[PDB]
Symmetry: C4
Subunit: 91 residues, 4 copies
Amino acid sequence: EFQVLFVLTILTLISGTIFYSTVEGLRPIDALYFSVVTLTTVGDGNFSPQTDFGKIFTILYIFIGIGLVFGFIHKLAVNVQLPSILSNLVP
Amino acid sequence: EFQVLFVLTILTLISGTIFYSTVEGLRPIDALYFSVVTLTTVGDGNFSPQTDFGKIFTILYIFIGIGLVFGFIHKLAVNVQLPSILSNLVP
Amino acid sequence: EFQVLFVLTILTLISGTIFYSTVEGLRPIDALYFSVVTLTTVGDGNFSPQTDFGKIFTILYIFIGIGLVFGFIHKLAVNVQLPSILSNLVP
Amino acid sequence: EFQVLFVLTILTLISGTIFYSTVEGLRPIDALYFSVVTLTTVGDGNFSPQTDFGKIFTILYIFIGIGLVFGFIHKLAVNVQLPSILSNLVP
Ligand code: NA
Ligand code: NA
Ligand code: NA
Ligand code: NA
Ligand code: NA
Ligand code: NA
């Protein structure tokens, strides 16, 4: 259940990082940052894709990735955080 | 169910793209990018509407579009992704 | 139900617009834009509060406003949009 | 219930503020602003981490903090706002 969504999102973040460092010429660490702030809908205030290929990629990358990247956070906050921090409140 | 929300959001993204390329003078591919990052609440870190008409349009475009654009992602992640990737885990 | 949340969010957006045009020196139409992109979590890619008073105001303005501003969109998309566009699909 | 999530998020915002003022060289009030706009997914349109350590920290800080920071807003809008403003509508 939780170990499946953990890999589905890693494959999704590794896909983004490979695309932006290649088409947009960004350093790998930067392309993983832009990819993460997008699927989480935080967004980057300094960089926006400057190629026609990047603009179209980001649009389709949002509608596909936000469903699962946000689907893992829901499982990562209710499977691991809730019970662990909850079962912690027993003195 | 899912084929209805697919067209409701396309009509909503085509509406945005036509407005920003005309009032703000943006190239069409850019206006579709700004329109997508808004309804998904990602946001663009380089461009903000520079006309009084664009500022008011974006405000009303957010409160109307975010309800359905996010209503399709919910259906696109539970109707197509969940069962397909789930039914995939059968060896 | 829906007419109550409609005024709760207007009072919340009118509060933001009055604060940023005064403390940050923004034109009123700009302060209403920055206030809307914040409570909806879209965010503005050109302006960030440049006064210590504005930085603290925005933080507390997010945790209080996002609960209701997003609580109206939920009602505005299920009370008015769902049944209207749904009852529309009857030929 | 609500007093537990109130401290879990303060510890989470105090963690962010200490990291960005130190690694990125930001003034404390600025690091608390960047930390708040991130966990709420608003995002800052002027600053993005400029060190390799900051870029990696922000990525892991998003996936851990957004689950609880958004889990408190849900409780802060349904435990305190709903009944208070609702019980207010009795003349
Ligand atoms: Na969001
Ligand atoms: Na954002
Ligand atoms: Na943003
Ligand atoms: Na700039
Ligand atoms: Na957002
Ligand atoms: Na900028």
